[PDB]
Homo-oligomer: A and B are copies of this chain.
Amino acid sequence: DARIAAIGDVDELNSQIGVLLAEPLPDDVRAALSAIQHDLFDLGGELCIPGHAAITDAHLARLDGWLAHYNGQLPPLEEFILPGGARGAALAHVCRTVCRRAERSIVALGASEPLNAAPRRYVNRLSDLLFVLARVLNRAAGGADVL
């Protein structure tokens, strides 16, 4: 059941990003989110079929790059913030939490079955990237994060 559950949560995460993608977004953000949807598709395909790996260092390198890029666009967070703000920002936070949920099950799968570490490392980074994108979307809307 661990594998079935992980496959499902990743699918749920990808669907939530589809909802975020239905919102107005900066071009750079839309492109990243779109590529991520393909990544999650490969990730899901990998958790399922045994002996087949699809997530590589390059995938992790791309997330690290987007993290570095977007974080450089924002001043370090000084105070704790609450999930919300502009609709796109709020949706990004929902995606963030669903990604963390998908991470918990992926970690569960790796604990009871031979699993490559790339999957969990990918969603670990995606969780942090969605947090940052929420901030970007709040600023892009002309607002600020909810403190």
Contact = CB atoms under 8 A, between A and B. Distances in A.
B4 A104 contact: yes
Interface stretch (A66-74, A86-94, A112-120): A86-94
B8 A82 contact: no
Given A80-B41, A82-B37, A108-B1, A91 B19 contact: yes
Interface residues of A, number: 40
A101 interface: yes
A100 B8 contact: yes
A19 B137 CA distance: 13
Contact of A98 (B12, B18, B41, B83): B12
Contacts of A98: 12
Contact of A94 (B9, B15, B37, B104): B15
A89 B16 CA distance: 11
B16 A94 contact: yes
Contacts of A89: 22
Interface of A: 1, 4-5, 8-9, 11-12, 14-19, 21-22, 34, 37-38, 41, 80, 82-87, 89-91, 93-94, 96-98, 100-101, 104, 107-108, 146
